[PDB]
Amino acid sequence: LGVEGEGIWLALGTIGMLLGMLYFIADGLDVQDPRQKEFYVITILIPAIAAASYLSMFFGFGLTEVSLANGRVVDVYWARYADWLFTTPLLLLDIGLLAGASQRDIGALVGIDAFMIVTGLVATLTKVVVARYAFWTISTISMVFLLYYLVAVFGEAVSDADEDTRSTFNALRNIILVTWAIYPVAWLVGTEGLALTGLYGETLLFMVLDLVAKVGFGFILLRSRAIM
Amino acid sequence: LGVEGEGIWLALGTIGMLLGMLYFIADGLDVQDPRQKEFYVITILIPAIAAASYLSMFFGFGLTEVSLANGRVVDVYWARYADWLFTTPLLLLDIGLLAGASQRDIGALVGIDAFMIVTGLVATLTKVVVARYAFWTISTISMVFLLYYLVAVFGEAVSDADEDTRSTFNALRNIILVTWAIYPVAWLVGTEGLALTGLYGETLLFMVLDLVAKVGFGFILLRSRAIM
Amino acid sequence: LGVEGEGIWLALGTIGMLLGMLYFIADGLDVQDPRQKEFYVITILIPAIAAASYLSMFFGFGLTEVSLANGRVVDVYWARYADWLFTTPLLLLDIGLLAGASQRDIGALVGIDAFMIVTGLVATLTKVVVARYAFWTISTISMVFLLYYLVAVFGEAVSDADEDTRSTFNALRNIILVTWAIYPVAWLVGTEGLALTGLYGETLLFMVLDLVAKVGFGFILLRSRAIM
Ligand SMILES: CCCCCCCC/C=C\CCCCCCCC(=O)OC[C@@H](O)CO
Numbered sequence: 001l002g003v004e005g006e007g008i009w010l011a012l013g014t015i016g017m018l019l020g021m022l023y024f025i026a027d028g029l030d031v032q033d034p035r036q037k038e039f040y041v042i043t044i045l046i047p048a049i050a051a052a053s054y055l056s057m058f059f060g061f062g063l064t065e066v067s068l069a070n071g072r073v074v075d076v077y078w079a080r081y082a083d084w085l086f087t088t089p090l091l092l093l094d095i096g097l098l099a100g101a102s103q104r105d106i107g108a109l110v111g112i113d114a115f116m117i118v119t120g121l122v123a124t125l126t127k128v129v130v131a132r133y134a135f136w137t138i139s140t141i142s143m144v145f146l147l148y149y150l151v152a153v154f155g156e157a158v159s160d161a162d163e164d165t166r167s168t169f170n171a172l173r174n175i176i177l178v179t180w181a182i183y184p185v186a187w188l189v190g191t192e193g194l195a196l197t198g199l200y201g202e203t204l205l206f207m208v209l210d211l212v213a214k215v216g217f218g219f220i221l222l223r224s225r226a227i228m
Numbered sequence: 229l230g231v232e233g234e235g236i237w238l239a240l241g242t243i244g245m246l247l248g249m250l251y252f253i254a255d256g257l258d259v260q261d262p263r264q265k266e267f268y269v270i271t272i273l274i275p276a277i278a279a280a281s282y283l284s285m286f287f288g289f290g291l292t293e294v295s296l297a298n299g300r301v302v303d304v305y306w307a308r309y310a311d312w313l314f315t316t317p318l319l320l321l322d323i324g325l326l327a328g329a330s331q332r333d334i335g336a337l338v339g340i341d342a343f344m345i346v347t348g349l350v351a352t353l354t355k356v357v358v359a360r361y362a363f364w365t366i367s368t369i370s371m372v373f374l375l376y377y378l379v380a381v382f383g384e385a386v387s388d389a390d391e392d393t394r395s396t397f398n399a400l401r402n403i404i405l406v407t408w409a410i411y412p413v414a415w416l417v418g419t420e421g422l423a424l425t426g427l428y429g430e431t432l433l434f435m436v437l438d439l440v441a442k443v444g445f446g447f448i449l450l451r452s453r454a455i456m
Numbered sequence: 457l458g459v460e461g462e463g464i465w466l467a468l469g470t471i472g473m474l475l476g477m478l479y480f481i482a483d484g485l486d487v488q489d490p491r492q493k494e495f496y497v498i499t500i501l502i503p504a505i506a507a508a509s510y511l512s513m514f515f516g517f518g519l520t521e522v523s524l525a526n527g528r529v530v531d532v533y534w535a536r537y538a539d540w541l542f543t544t545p546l547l548l549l550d551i552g553l554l555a556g557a558s559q560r561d562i563g564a565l566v567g568i569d570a571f572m573i574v575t576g577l578v579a580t581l582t583k584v585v586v587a588r589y590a591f592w593t594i595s596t597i598s599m600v601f602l603l604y605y606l607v608a609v610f611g612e613a614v615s616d617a618d619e620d621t622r623s624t625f626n627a628l629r630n631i632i633l634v635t636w637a638i639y640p641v642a643w644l645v646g647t648e649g650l651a652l653t654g655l656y657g658e659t660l661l662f663m664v665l666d667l668v669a670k671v672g673f674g675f676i677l678l679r680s681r682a683i684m
Pocket residue numbers: 103104105107108110111112114115118119122494497498505508509512518535538539542546
């Protein structure tokens with residue numbers, strides 16, 4: 001339900017995350033080695049967090065109304081950003097641990113990621129239309145850099161590893177590039193930006209993106225020989 | 229002194245934390261060795277945070293009214309959660325460093341702790357009654373997970389340590405298990421939950437729990453041979 | 457344009473931070489060595505964050521009104537604290553890495569820093585007049601601690617290093633001591649505290665302090681042979 005029917009995607013999203021989390025848990029019951037176990041922990045925590053955010057939004061807590069200087073009223077699920085603030089660095093940690101990136105490089109990307117999510121949240125909450133777009137632009141620029149550094153810096157880090165590790169890395173990297181690049185488009189075409197689509201469409205789009213980026217990614221990671 | 233006299237416990241809690249903090253600082257003045265000193269820093273910082281949160285609540289900052297969909301109006305001291313968000317991980321850090329747990333395991337427990345505190349805050353703040361209990365359940369589940377991993381993972385980590393360190397670990401573990409397990413019950417019986425007791429009783433109970441969990445714990449930790 | 461003209465300093469602040477960030481980026485383009493690279497990443501991220509913060513304030517995001525129990529109504533840019541919450545630990549990381557301080561000493565300063573910024577935020581937002589000054593006093597006390605530890609603990613850590621590093625460290629330390637010490641004074645003389653000056657003057661003062669503390673500090677750090 002929700003404001004305009006979009007709660008269905010919230011509920012499905014919850015269940016989806018919850019199913020993936022349970023699958024991951026079920027997958028790691030028989031694992032002793034600490035590094036593999038670390039990948040389990042991170043990758044279980046990610047959809048746990050996303051399931052809880054989704055559930056909060058289904059119930060109406062992740063939701064505030066914002067009145068723009070436009071007179072335009074926008075229905076804002078801000079719990080997304082809460083979710084994103086924690087799960088995107090964890091996803092970066094996951095693949096960075098896969099890649100054998102240094103503490104330094106992971107920290108760098110996480111810093112950039114955090115900047116990206118917070119300036120996104122400002123873009124979403126600000127009443128000034130020009131501010132909305134300026135911050136969407138700042139956030140997207142930071143995203144472009146994050147994705148470049150992911151490719152160059154983590155790719156270099158993974159370049160001396162075995163074939164399975166490099167292969168899994170490349171798969172996960174491409175999942176990040178494609179799915180993560182779509183989020184700013186989604187923001188632009190949904191109600192928060194140009195409102196070409198409404199809340200229902202936008203919510204469906206982010207449900208699909210989140211499911212791919214968290215459960216799809218998690219599946220690909222946790223099944224690899226690379227983490228083993 | 230608050231909405232219904234509970235400020236007196238807010239005042240006593242403040243004073244108690246402060247006195248604990250002062251004792252610990254005074255206890256640590258001559259400490260030179262870095263690991264021991266690290267236990268002092270963490271264990272001083274905890275009641276400092278809690279003293280500051282209690283004082284903010286005493287002044288009414290960090291108190292909000294929440295009107296539930298039931299119509300019931302609840303007086304919510306949310307700054308407690310801010311306090312907990314940082315202090316419960318520090319407590320876990322404290323016992324982890326005592327146990328000789330790895331960076332990974334500690335991070336894991338901090339993760340699940342964070343999940344517990346945040347979902348508990350959602351439980352406290354959401355207007356939808358079924359949601360309040362759903363989130364309380366999610367949070368309590370995480371608590372059980374957390375406590376189990378504390379016993380099994382940190383207990384296994386400490387199992388190769390000397391007798392003093394094992395015995396201290398067992399004391400601190402038992403403090404956490406007993407006191408921390410009561411918090412969700414307190415929430416349930418207090419005004420955010422079943423409202424079997426009013427704001428005053430609940431504030432008293434959390435004051436006692438907080439004091440044992442921070443000052444009692446701290447005292448037991450810092451007086452041990454184990455950290456020297 | 458601001459509430460009372462202070463927008464001019466928000467804009468000039470935005471621009472100076474952005475130019476500092478771009479200068480640092482230009483300067484670090486060929487840097488290959490990992491350790492110097494870290495200094496670049498941190499020192500570039502600091503004015504990035506501060507620039508985004510300034511821009512948010514310029515657009516009126518991050519500005520609330522607080523009605524005090526006195527009846528005074530205060531125009532409070534709270535986004536500053538958001539800014540400070542992240543940049544001040546990073547500044548501390550930057551100099552700690554320069555000083556060769558341990559993870560524990562750095563974490564310690566970051567923890568007391570965090571305490572300082574959050575208690576200052578409480579001071580800024582609380583409606584209770586006595587509480588404003590109580591938290592300002594708490595915060596300033598922790599600042600004094602932080603500065604002493606910075607001098608004693610980072611000074612000892614840096615004491616075994618080469619002369620270039622000790623000298624650069626002493627330069628950066630003195631910038632922190634002098635500029636950081638002025639902030640609580642600025643809070644006290646400005647509209648949040650005794651109101652001896654208005655929002656325009658206070659905003660100007662913080663702009664100058666922030667520019668020195670971030671771009672001046674970053675310049676001195678990044679141009680030193682010590683980090684290369
Ligand atoms: C009003 C909002 C204005 C924008 C606020 C943006 C706040 C988010 C930005 C940054 C927060 C994340 C900071 C991340 C800080 C990362 C520090 C780092 O690079 O560590 C490297 C070491 O591990 C190497 O050994």
